[PDB]
Amino acid sequence: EDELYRQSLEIISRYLREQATGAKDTKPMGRSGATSRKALETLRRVGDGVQRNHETAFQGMLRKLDIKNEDDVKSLSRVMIHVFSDGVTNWGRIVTLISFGAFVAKHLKTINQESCIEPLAESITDVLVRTKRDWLVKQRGWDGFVEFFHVED
Amino acid sequence: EDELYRQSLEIISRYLREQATGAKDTKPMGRSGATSRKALETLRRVGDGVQRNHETAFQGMLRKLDIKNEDDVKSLSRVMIHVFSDGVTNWGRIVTLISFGAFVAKHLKTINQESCIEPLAESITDVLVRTKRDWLVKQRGWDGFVEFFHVEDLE
Amino acid sequence: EDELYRQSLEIISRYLREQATGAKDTKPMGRSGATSRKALETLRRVGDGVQRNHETAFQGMLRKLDIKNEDDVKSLSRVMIHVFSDGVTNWGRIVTLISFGAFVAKHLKTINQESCIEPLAESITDVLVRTKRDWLVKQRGWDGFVEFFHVEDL
Amino acid sequence: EDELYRQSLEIISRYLREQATGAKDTKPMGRSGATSRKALETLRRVGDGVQRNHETAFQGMLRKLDIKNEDDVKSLSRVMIHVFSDGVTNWGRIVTLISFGAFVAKHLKTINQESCIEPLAESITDVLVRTKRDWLVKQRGWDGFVEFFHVEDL
Amino acid sequence: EDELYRQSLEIISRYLREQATGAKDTKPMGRSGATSRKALETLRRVGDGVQRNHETAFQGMLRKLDIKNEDDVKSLSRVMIHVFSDGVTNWGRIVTLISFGAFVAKHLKTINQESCIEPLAESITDVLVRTKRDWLVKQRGWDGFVEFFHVEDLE
Amino acid sequence: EDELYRQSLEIISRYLREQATGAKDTKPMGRSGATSRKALETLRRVGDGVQRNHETAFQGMLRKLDIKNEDDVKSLSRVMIHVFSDGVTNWGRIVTLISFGAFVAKHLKTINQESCIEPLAESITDVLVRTKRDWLVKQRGWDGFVEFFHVEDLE
Amino acid sequence: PGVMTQEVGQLLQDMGDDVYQQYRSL
Amino acid sequence: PGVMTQEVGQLLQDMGDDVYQQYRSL
Amino acid sequence: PGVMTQEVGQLLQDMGDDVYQQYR
Amino acid sequence: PGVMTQEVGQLLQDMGDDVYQQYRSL
Amino acid sequence: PGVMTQEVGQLLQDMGDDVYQQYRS
Amino acid sequence: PGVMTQEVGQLLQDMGDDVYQQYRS
């Protein structure tokens, strides 16, 4: 098994799920729960921020992508890969990736395609862990995620 | 008027009473109900582990405290303060305090002083709430208690 | 035979019997009559005092031991051994053990198990003699017990 | 506010604390993290290395100072001043001082004077900022500290 | 065969065990009763003084040694040997070792490990006699100890 | 044999040891040393005074030497020989070599290397006896030492 | 457990020692 | 002292921290 | 398991030396 | 009647320069 | 190792001779 | 003297709690 994959999927799926349904399913998490929950709180804060910032734009961007069913999920994967196609990796792009993903999740609920929400979270989790694992470990995984977006109080 | 104090008192007093009677009382629960019951379950499992681990040491420690009647409960309040006097606070120290509090509860039943059980749980709740309100809220109360001692895995 | 053991049995059995019964016996001893009688009177004085002092505690302590019949009398043997489980031995520890024995005897009568009183006194006598006989002979037996608990004239 | 002070204290206080308590802590930092965490990690690497390299000498040096309580903390302040007395300043001298502080913190734990640890961290944070603030901000503060002791292979 | 060892173990055990008890045992000594009794009285006076003075320090020092039971006794022996590493032997170091031992003895009662008190007194006696016997004979044994700590009476 | 190496080592070692620890130790010197006790008194009187006068300089000079373990004792031997390299021998140079040796002894205790102090006194005694034995005898040994530094007082 | 002999045993130890303190010659 | 709050408290501290190390997310 | 042997040892040494001279 | 702190300071002064010279620098 | 020896030795000489002159008379 | 009701009460108390065990859940 892969511990980093399990944690990331848990965090991303829960966020996309709660962004879609509009609830909050804070049940017993994984083994590294403290990190996961802090990361999810950070994701709630920054993610919503990015969304309210670019919601108008996201609407047209997703519209242009024309996502109708699970076959169209591989189209999001191409978009995700293309984001990092300049060799550059940082937390800004990563949180934006997940933020757009949450926007797609709501759309999937709107067009009655909630079955595609888990494959969507999987695809997002994949491109991060399958292709950017080295950077993630260097940046201390999700610990570094929370640290980067910590402000302020 | 203080839900945190009420909830904390319930969990701890439930633990101390049932540890003394020996009878795992299953009459749940109260307001929050869910979290409170999950806290009592976690307290049982983890606490009994600590009590079994340090049963030998706990016996001598309580012996030196010389707790006979109601007035001696005040002596335990002083101990609980010394547990945090180094400024360090964590769930490990808090739960061990409750585990030892439960050990005293077993003892109070032995010397036929069951009437001192409730003031014992109250004194524990006092120190924790009076002196660690901020830490408890920052750690999200008894939800951060169940979150910390959570064990799962294997599939 | 064991002269020290036999006198110890008689004294402790007498005390535990009359404590349970409620009335002192008080039939004359009993081989070495003088000392044995003085020990019992002394035991009545100090022993009742210990019971009156620690009665609340004794009730709970005995309750936890769950004594219902003669089979449980043997369980009290492990307790009596523990009272000395540190080498320490004095007349106070001995008279307290006997005082707790009298308290157990009353409980036995209360639950209609008077047939366990006599084996209890034997078990008490056993532990005292078996493990600390060398101590007992050194403190001059029951003459020393009487001497230690003698309170000045006036 | 002295922004360099809250950061410096936080780093030095955290190091001394985990060195004394024996087990390193993990809590997130204050302002944003990143640098302060990098400084603490660096301080662990270099500092523990310094201690292991000069543990024997530290034992006697500290013994001579005779630190028993919070009153003796002031004596340490004069030791810290003497380190930079010749007008010379470098990252090696700074980390060695903080390393000695961690060694002192362990001693304060050993003699049940843990309440002196935080005052000790303050006194160390004091010396650096008070007399060497210009030098500190000129070397980019703790970013420079991390840069100096950077050694990475890959 | 070693009268010095027997008398030493006797005096040290008597002091430690009674410091653990919280009350003094005055019963007669084995061989030379007068000397040993006088040594026990002197050790009580000086030893209780040393403990009251360095109580706070002793608490942390023993805490770091992490004595839990009999298997940790040899850790104390290593400390005792280290007390004489710089070559200097005197009564101050000796009575402080004994005083710290009595402090360890009280702690042993606190954690319900009173059985380790005899091996504690033994190792303390062992270090003194195995490594510093020549010194002890030269200082006239426990006669010198009493003499050393004898205090002026103001006539 | 070599009665002169003995006593010399004794006087120098006594001085270096006592300057390190802080106070004095076993007073009865062995020779029998009335002279040995005189010399130790003279050495501690004159030596301390010299140490106070050049404490500033000794610090830098010793720091320059950089002594940190037993292998560095050899570097001190080289310095001592260089003091007599001009052919001139007197009590002023000899007593100053022992004062500086005492200053080193304190330093070795500061860096927790007290075990080097005895090999240090050994090297100091070595140089003086190996290279200056005839002069010592001709100047009547430690009796010529005390006689030189004896101040008339009077009155 | 299920017979705390050490517990009641230790309690009797303290009580007995107090009794010794009460009657001993001062 | 005659009231042993400090020793028991300090003992409880170390036992608590051991528990802390036991269940803390490794 | 105590790695404190030298540390506690030297602490007792200094304390013992202070008891010395208090009674010397 | 006072501990010389220049000595301890001078030692730390020397040790610090060695740590500086050590291949963290140069 | 030993890189000094000298300087230190000569310093000790003069101090010694000063002490020599101090107690000479 | 006196009728120790406290003793009989605690006796009934334990028997009662055992009857609970025999018949509960």
PDB file of N, CA and C in Angstrom, chain D residues 55-133:
ATOM      1  N   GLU D  55      30.853  17.401  24.305  1.00  0.00           N
ATOM      2  CA  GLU D  55      30.050  17.055  25.478  1.00  0.00           C
ATOM      3  C   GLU D  55      30.881  17.024  26.756  1.00  0.00           C
ATOM      4  N   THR D  56      32.054  16.404  26.678  1.00  0.00           N
ATOM      5  CA  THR D  56      32.937  16.280  27.830  1.00  0.00           C
ATOM      6  C   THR D  56      33.321  17.650  28.377  1.00  0.00           C
ATOM      7  N   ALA D  57      33.801  18.523  27.496  1.00  0.00           N
ATOM      8  CA  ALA D  57      34.187  19.872  27.891  1.00  0.00           C
ATOM      9  C   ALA D  57      33.007  20.673  28.440  1.00  0.00           C
ATOM     10  N   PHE D  58      31.848  20.552  27.798  1.00  0.00           N
ATOM     11  CA  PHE D  58      30.645  21.233  28.271  1.00  0.00           C
ATOM     12  C   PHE D  58      30.305  20.857  29.713  1.00  0.00           C
ATOM     13  N   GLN D  59      30.525  19.591  30.056  1.00  0.00           N
ATOM     14  CA  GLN D  59      30.198  19.070  31.381  1.00  0.00           C
ATOM     15  C   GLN D  59      30.955  19.803  32.485  1.00  0.00           C
ATOM     16  N   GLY D  60      32.247  20.027  32.270  1.00  0.00           N
ATOM     17  CA  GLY D  60      33.064  20.725  33.245  1.00  0.00           C
ATOM     18  C   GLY D  60      32.864  22.231  33.229  1.00  0.00           C
ATOM     19  N   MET D  61      32.739  22.798  32.031  1.00  0.00           N
ATOM     20  CA  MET D  61      32.524  24.235  31.870  1.00  0.00           C
ATOM     21  C   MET D  61      31.259  24.690  32.597  1.00  0.00           C
ATOM     22  N   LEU D  62      30.177  23.944  32.405  1.00  0.00           N
ATOM     23  CA  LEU D  62      28.911  24.227  33.070  1.00  0.00           C
ATOM     24  C   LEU D  62      29.017  24.004  34.576  1.00  0.00           C
ATOM     25  N   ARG D  63      29.756  22.969  34.963  1.00  0.00           N
ATOM     26  CA  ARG D  63      29.954  22.643  36.371  1.00  0.00           C
ATOM     27  C   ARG D  63      30.620  23.796  37.116  1.00  0.00           C
ATOM     28  N   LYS D  64      31.590  24.431  36.467  1.00  0.00           N
ATOM     29  CA  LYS D  64      32.312  25.554  37.056  1.00  0.00           C
ATOM     30  C   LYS D  64      31.398  26.756  37.279  1.00  0.00           C
ATOM     31  N   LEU D  65      30.464  26.966  36.355  1.00  0.00           N
ATOM     32  CA  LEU D  65      29.544  28.092  36.448  1.00  0.00           C
ATOM     33  C   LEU D  65      28.588  27.924  37.624  1.00  0.00           C
ATOM     34  N   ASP D  66      28.370  26.672  38.017  1.00  0.00           N
ATOM     35  CA  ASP D  66      27.570  26.336  39.194  1.00  0.00           C
ATOM     36  C   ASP D  66      26.152  26.901  39.123  1.00  0.00           C
ATOM     37  N   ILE D  67      25.389  26.449  38.134  1.00  0.00           N
ATOM     38  CA  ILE D  67      24.016  26.901  37.955  1.00  0.00           C
ATOM     39  C   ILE D  67      23.068  26.050  38.792  1.00  0.00           C
ATOM     40  N   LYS D  68      22.424  26.674  39.775  1.00  0.00           N
ATOM     41  CA  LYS D  68      21.519  25.959  40.670  1.00  0.00           C
ATOM     42  C   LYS D  68      20.072  26.415  40.510  1.00  0.00           C
ATOM     43  N   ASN D  69      19.882  27.703  40.242  1.00  0.00           N
ATOM     44  CA  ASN D  69      18.538  28.253  40.102  1.00  0.00           C
ATOM     45  C   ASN D  69      18.456  29.454  39.161  1.00  0.00           C
ATOM     46  N   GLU D  70      17.307  30.123  39.172  1.00  0.00           N
ATOM     47  CA  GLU D  70      17.033  31.220  38.251  1.00  0.00           C
ATOM     48  C   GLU D  70      17.911  32.447  38.511  1.00  0.00           C
ATOM     49  N   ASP D  71      18.449  32.551  39.723  1.00  0.00           N
ATOM     50  CA  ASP D  71      19.346  33.651  40.065  1.00  0.00           C
ATOM     51  C   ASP D  71      20.675  33.521  39.330  1.00  0.00           C
ATOM     52  N   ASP D  72      21.078  32.283  39.066  1.00  0.00           N
ATOM     53  CA  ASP D  72      22.358  32.011  38.421  1.00  0.00           C
ATOM     54  C   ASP D  72      22.275  32.164  36.904  1.00  0.00           C
ATOM     55  N   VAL D  73      21.067  32.405  36.403  1.00  0.00           N
ATOM     56  CA  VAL D  73      20.850  32.637  34.978  1.00  0.00           C
ATOM     57  C   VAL D  73      21.622  33.870  34.512  1.00  0.00           C
ATOM     58  N   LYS D  74      21.643  34.897  35.357  1.00  0.00           N
ATOM     59  CA  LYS D  74      22.345  36.141  35.054  1.00  0.00           C
ATOM     60  C   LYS D  74      23.840  35.922  34.806  1.00  0.00           C
ATOM     61  N   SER D  75      24.412  34.924  35.476  1.00  0.00           N
ATOM     62  CA  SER D  75      25.826  34.602  35.314  1.00  0.00           C
ATOM     63  C   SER D  75      26.103  34.128  33.894  1.00  0.00           C
ATOM     64  N   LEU D  76      25.132  33.428  33.316  1.00  0.00           N
ATOM     65  CA  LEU D  76      25.261  32.903  31.965  1.00  0.00           C
ATOM     66  C   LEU D  76      25.262  34.017  30.927  1.00  0.00           C
ATOM     67  N   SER D  77      24.540  35.097  31.217  1.00  0.00           N
ATOM     68  CA  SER D  77      24.456  36.236  30.308  1.00  0.00           C
ATOM     69  C   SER D  77      25.834  36.841  30.055  1.00  0.00           C
ATOM     70  N   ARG D  78      26.664  36.869  31.091  1.00  0.00           N
ATOM     71  CA  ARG D  78      28.005  37.430  30.980  1.00  0.00           C
ATOM     72  C   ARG D  78      28.929  36.506  30.190  1.00  0.00           C
ATOM     73  N   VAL D  79      28.661  35.206  30.259  1.00  0.00           N
ATOM     74  CA  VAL D  79      29.387  34.230  29.457  1.00  0.00           C
ATOM     75  C   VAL D  79      29.094  34.451  27.974  1.00  0.00           C
ATOM     76  N   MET D  80      27.824  34.687  27.658  1.00  0.00           N
ATOM     77  CA  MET D  80      27.389  34.916  26.283  1.00  0.00           C
ATOM     78  C   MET D  80      28.019  36.177  25.702  1.00  0.00           C
ATOM     79  N   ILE D  81      28.136  37.210  26.530  1.00  0.00           N
ATOM     80  CA  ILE D  81      28.750  38.465  26.112  1.00  0.00           C
ATOM     81  C   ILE D  81      30.223  38.270  25.753  1.00  0.00           C
ATOM     82  N   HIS D  82      30.930  37.487  26.565  1.00  0.00           N
ATOM     83  CA  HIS D  82      32.355  37.238  26.349  1.00  0.00           C
ATOM     84  C   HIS D  82      32.644  36.531  25.029  1.00  0.00           C
ATOM     85  N   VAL D  83      31.644  35.837  24.495  1.00  0.00           N
ATOM     86  CA  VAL D  83      31.804  35.111  23.241  1.00  0.00           C
ATOM     87  C   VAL D  83      32.075  36.072  22.085  1.00  0.00           C
ATOM     88  N   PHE D  84      31.424  37.231  22.124  1.00  0.00           N
ATOM     89  CA  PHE D  84      31.539  38.219  21.057  1.00  0.00           C
ATOM     90  C   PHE D  84      32.344  39.432  21.515  1.00  0.00           C
ATOM     91  N   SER D  85      33.206  39.233  22.507  1.00  0.00           N
ATOM     92  CA  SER D  85      33.939  40.340  23.119  1.00  0.00           C
ATOM     93  C   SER D  85      35.057  40.897  22.240  1.00  0.00           C
ATOM     94  N   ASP D  86      35.642  40.048  21.401  1.00  0.00           N
ATOM     95  CA  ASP D  86      36.758  40.466  20.558  1.00  0.00           C
ATOM     96  C   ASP D  86      36.297  41.129  19.261  1.00  0.00           C
ATOM     97  N   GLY D  87      35.004  41.423  19.177  1.00  0.00           N
ATOM     98  CA  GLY D  87      34.441  42.095  18.019  1.00  0.00           C
ATOM     99  C   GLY D  87      34.130  41.155  16.870  1.00  0.00           C
ATOM    100  N   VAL D  88      34.459  39.881  17.052  1.00  0.00           N
ATOM    101  CA  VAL D  88      34.259  38.874  16.016  1.00  0.00           C
ATOM    102  C   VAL D  88      32.871  38.243  16.107  1.00  0.00           C
ATOM    103  N   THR D  89      32.238  38.043  14.954  1.00  0.00           N
ATOM    104  CA  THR D  89      30.923  37.418  14.898  1.00  0.00           C
ATOM    105  C   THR D  89      30.783  36.537  13.660  1.00  0.00           C
ATOM    106  N   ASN D  90      30.372  35.291  13.876  1.00  0.00           N
ATOM    107  CA  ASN D  90      30.026  34.385  12.785  1.00  0.00           C
ATOM    108  C   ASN D  90      28.969  33.363  13.209  1.00  0.00           C
ATOM    109  N   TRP D  91      28.404  32.657  12.238  1.00  0.00           N
ATOM    110  CA  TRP D  91      27.349  31.694  12.526  1.00  0.00           C
ATOM    111  C   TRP D  91      27.813  30.524  13.397  1.00  0.00           C
ATOM    112  N   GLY D  92      29.102  30.203  13.318  1.00  0.00           N
ATOM    113  CA  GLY D  92      29.681  29.156  14.139  1.00  0.00           C
ATOM    114  C   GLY D  92      29.622  29.486  15.619  1.00  0.00           C
ATOM    115  N   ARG D  93      29.965  30.726  15.956  1.00  0.00           N
ATOM    116  CA  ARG D  93      29.949  31.186  17.341  1.00  0.00           C
ATOM    117  C   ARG D  93      28.531  31.252  17.901  1.00  0.00           C
ATOM    118  N   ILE D  94      27.573  31.606  17.050  1.00  0.00           N
ATOM    119  CA  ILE D  94      26.182  31.725  17.478  1.00  0.00           C
ATOM    120  C   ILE D  94      25.571  30.361  17.787  1.00  0.00           C
ATOM    121  N   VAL D  95      25.800  29.396  16.901  1.00  0.00           N
ATOM    122  CA  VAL D  95      25.236  28.063  17.070  1.00  0.00           C
ATOM    123  C   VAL D  95      25.879  27.324  18.247  1.00  0.00           C
ATOM    124  N   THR D  96      27.149  27.614  18.515  1.00  0.00           N
ATOM    125  CA  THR D  96      27.860  27.002  19.637  1.00  0.00           C
ATOM    126  C   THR D  96      27.281  27.486  20.964  1.00  0.00           C
ATOM    127  N   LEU D  97      26.992  28.781  21.032  1.00  0.00           N
ATOM    128  CA  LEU D  97      26.368  29.381  22.204  1.00  0.00           C
ATOM    129  C   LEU D  97      24.993  28.775  22.477  1.00  0.00           C
ATOM    130  N   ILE D  98      24.174  28.672  21.438  1.00  0.00           N
ATOM    131  CA  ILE D  98      22.854  28.072  21.569  1.00  0.00           C
ATOM    132  C   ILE D  98      22.974  26.581  21.912  1.00  0.00           C
ATOM    133  N   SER D  99      24.035  25.950  21.413  1.00  0.00           N
ATOM    134  CA  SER D  99      24.300  24.546  21.705  1.00  0.00           C
ATOM    135  C   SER D  99      24.644  24.362  23.180  1.00  0.00           C
ATOM    136  N   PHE D 100      25.395  25.315  23.719  1.00  0.00           N
ATOM    137  CA  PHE D 100      25.764  25.284  25.127  1.00  0.00           C
ATOM    138  C   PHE D 100      24.522  25.524  25.969  1.00  0.00           C
ATOM    139  N   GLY D 101      23.630  26.365  25.456  1.00  0.00           N
ATOM    140  CA  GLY D 101      22.368  26.640  26.117  1.00  0.00           C
ATOM    141  C   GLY D 101      21.505  25.401  26.239  1.00  0.00           C
ATOM    142  N   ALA D 102      21.464  24.610  25.174  1.00  0.00           N
ATOM    143  CA  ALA D 102      20.724  23.359  25.187  1.00  0.00           C
ATOM    144  C   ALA D 102      21.320  22.407  26.214  1.00  0.00           C
ATOM    145  N   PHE D 103      22.646  22.404  26.309  1.00  0.00           N
ATOM    146  CA  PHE D 103      23.335  21.578  27.286  1.00  0.00           C
ATOM    147  C   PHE D 103      22.984  22.039  28.701  1.00  0.00           C
ATOM    148  N   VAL D 104      22.904  23.354  28.885  1.00  0.00           N
ATOM    149  CA  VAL D 104      22.495  23.938  30.161  1.00  0.00           C
ATOM    150  C   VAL D 104      21.046  23.578  30.492  1.00  0.00           C
ATOM    151  N   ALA D 105      20.194  23.548  29.469  1.00  0.00           N
ATOM    152  CA  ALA D 105      18.777  23.239  29.658  1.00  0.00           C
ATOM    153  C   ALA D 105      18.567  21.822  30.193  1.00  0.00           C
ATOM    154  N   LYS D 106      19.371  20.886  29.696  1.00  0.00           N
ATOM    155  CA  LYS D 106      19.334  19.507  30.164  1.00  0.00           C
ATOM    156  C   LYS D 106      19.696  19.439  31.642  1.00  0.00           C
ATOM    157  N   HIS D 107      20.694  20.228  32.023  1.00  0.00           N
ATOM    158  CA  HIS D 107      21.140  20.330  33.411  1.00  0.00           C
ATOM    159  C   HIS D 107      20.048  20.890  34.314  1.00  0.00           C
ATOM    160  N   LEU D 108      19.300  21.861  33.800  1.00  0.00           N
ATOM    161  CA  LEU D 108      18.213  22.466  34.558  1.00  0.00           C
ATOM    162  C   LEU D 108      17.100  21.452  34.797  1.00  0.00           C
ATOM    163  N   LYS D 109      16.922  20.543  33.844  1.00  0.00           N
ATOM    164  CA  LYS D 109      15.964  19.455  33.984  1.00  0.00           C
ATOM    165  C   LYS D 109      16.462  18.466  35.028  1.00  0.00           C
ATOM    166  N   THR D 110      17.760  18.181  34.980  1.00  0.00           N
ATOM    167  CA  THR D 110      18.384  17.210  35.872  1.00  0.00           C
ATOM    168  C   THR D 110      18.272  17.613  37.344  1.00  0.00           C
ATOM    169  N   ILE D 111      18.319  18.914  37.615  1.00  0.00           N
ATOM    170  CA  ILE D 111      18.230  19.389  38.993  1.00  0.00           C
ATOM    171  C   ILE D 111      16.862  19.973  39.352  1.00  0.00           C
ATOM    172  N   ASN D 112      15.843  19.603  38.581  1.00  0.00           N
ATOM    173  CA  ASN D 112      14.454  19.972  38.875  1.00  0.00           C
ATOM    174  C   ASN D 112      14.222  21.483  38.875  1.00  0.00           C
ATOM    175  N   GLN D 113      14.852  22.174  37.929  1.00  0.00           N
ATOM    176  CA  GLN D 113      14.671  23.615  37.789  1.00  0.00           C
ATOM    177  C   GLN D 113      14.246  23.966  36.368  1.00  0.00           C
ATOM    178  N   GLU D 114      13.216  23.279  35.884  1.00  0.00           N
ATOM    179  CA  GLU D 114      12.741  23.459  34.515  1.00  0.00           C
ATOM    180  C   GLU D 114      12.122  24.835  34.280  1.00  0.00           C
ATOM    181  N   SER D 115      11.738  25.510  35.358  1.00  0.00           N
ATOM    182  CA  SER D 115      11.144  26.839  35.255  1.00  0.00           C
ATOM    183  C   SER D 115      12.188  27.890  34.887  1.00  0.00           C
ATOM    184  N   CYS D 116      13.451  27.477  34.855  1.00  0.00           N
ATOM    185  CA  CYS D 116      14.550  28.368  34.503  1.00  0.00           C
ATOM    186  C   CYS D 116      14.885  28.288  33.015  1.00  0.00           C
ATOM    187  N   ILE D 117      14.324  27.293  32.336  1.00  0.00           N
ATOM    188  CA  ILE D 117      14.627  27.052  30.929  1.00  0.00           C
ATOM    189  C   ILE D 117      14.162  28.188  30.016  1.00  0.00           C
ATOM    190  N   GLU D 118      12.890  28.557  30.119  1.00  0.00           N
ATOM    191  CA  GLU D 118      12.357  29.672  29.334  1.00  0.00           C
ATOM    192  C   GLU D 118      13.060  31.009  29.619  1.00  0.00           C
ATOM    193  N   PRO D 119      13.344  31.314  30.902  1.00  0.00           N
ATOM    194  CA  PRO D 119      14.194  32.482  31.160  1.00  0.00           C
ATOM    195  C   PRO D 119      15.573  32.360  30.520  1.00  0.00           C
ATOM    196  N   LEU D 120      16.123  31.149  30.469  1.00  0.00           N
ATOM    197  CA  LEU D 120      17.419  30.933  29.830  1.00  0.00           C
ATOM    198  C   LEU D 120      17.351  31.239  28.336  1.00  0.00           C
ATOM    199  N   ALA D 121      16.283  30.778  27.691  1.00  0.00           N
ATOM    200  CA  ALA D 121      16.078  31.014  26.264  1.00  0.00           C
ATOM    201  C   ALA D 121      15.938  32.503  25.972  1.00  0.00           C
ATOM    202  N   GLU D 122      15.287  33.218  26.886  1.00  0.00           N
ATOM    203  CA  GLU D 122      15.106  34.659  26.756  1.00  0.00           C
ATOM    204  C   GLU D 122      16.440  35.387  26.851  1.00  0.00           C
ATOM    205  N   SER D 123      17.276  34.957  27.791  1.00  0.00           N
ATOM    206  CA  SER D 123      18.582  35.575  27.999  1.00  0.00           C
ATOM    207  C   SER D 123      19.501  35.366  26.800  1.00  0.00           C
ATOM    208  N   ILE D 124      19.372  34.214  26.153  1.00  0.00           N
ATOM    209  CA  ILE D 124      20.139  33.924  24.947  1.00  0.00           C
ATOM    210  C   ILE D 124      19.615  34.750  23.777  1.00  0.00           C
ATOM    211  N   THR D 125      18.296  34.793  23.638  1.00  0.00           N
ATOM    212  CA  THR D 125      17.659  35.605  22.610  1.00  0.00           C
ATOM    213  C   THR D 125      17.983  37.086  22.818  1.00  0.00           C
ATOM    214  N   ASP D 126      18.154  37.481  24.077  1.00  0.00           N
ATOM    215  CA  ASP D 126      18.504  38.859  24.417  1.00  0.00           C
ATOM    216  C   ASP D 126      19.854  39.279  23.852  1.00  0.00           C
ATOM    217  N   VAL D 127      20.896  38.539  24.222  1.00  0.00           N
ATOM    218  CA  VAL D 127      22.264  38.853  23.818  1.00  0.00           C
ATOM    219  C   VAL D 127      22.415  39.040  22.311  1.00  0.00           C
ATOM    220  N   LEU D 128      21.865  38.105  21.542  1.00  0.00           N
ATOM    221  CA  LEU D 128      21.993  38.136  20.089  1.00  0.00           C
ATOM    222  C   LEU D 128      21.355  39.385  19.490  1.00  0.00           C
ATOM    223  N   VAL D 129      20.135  39.684  19.920  1.00  0.00           N
ATOM    224  CA  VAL D 129      19.393  40.827  19.398  1.00  0.00           C
ATOM    225  C   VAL D 129      19.914  42.163  19.932  1.00  0.00           C
ATOM    226  N   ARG D 130      20.258  42.204  21.216  1.00  0.00           N
ATOM    227  CA  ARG D 130      20.671  43.453  21.852  1.00  0.00           C
ATOM    228  C   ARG D 130      21.925  44.059  21.231  1.00  0.00           C
ATOM    229  N   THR D 131      22.987  43.265  21.147  1.00  0.00           N
ATOM    230  CA  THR D 131      24.281  43.787  20.725  1.00  0.00           C
ATOM    231  C   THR D 131      24.612  43.468  19.269  1.00  0.00           C
ATOM    232  N   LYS D 132      23.917  42.490  18.695  1.00  0.00           N
ATOM    233  CA  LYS D 132      24.226  42.047  17.340  1.00  0.00           C
ATOM    234  C   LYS D 132      23.008  42.058  16.417  1.00  0.00           C
ATOM    235  N   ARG D 133      22.127  43.043  16.571  1.00  0.00           N
ATOM    236  CA  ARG D 133      20.953  43.107  15.705  1.00  0.00           C
ATOM    237  C   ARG D 133      21.324  43.521  14.288  1.00  0.00           C
TER     238      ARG D 133
END
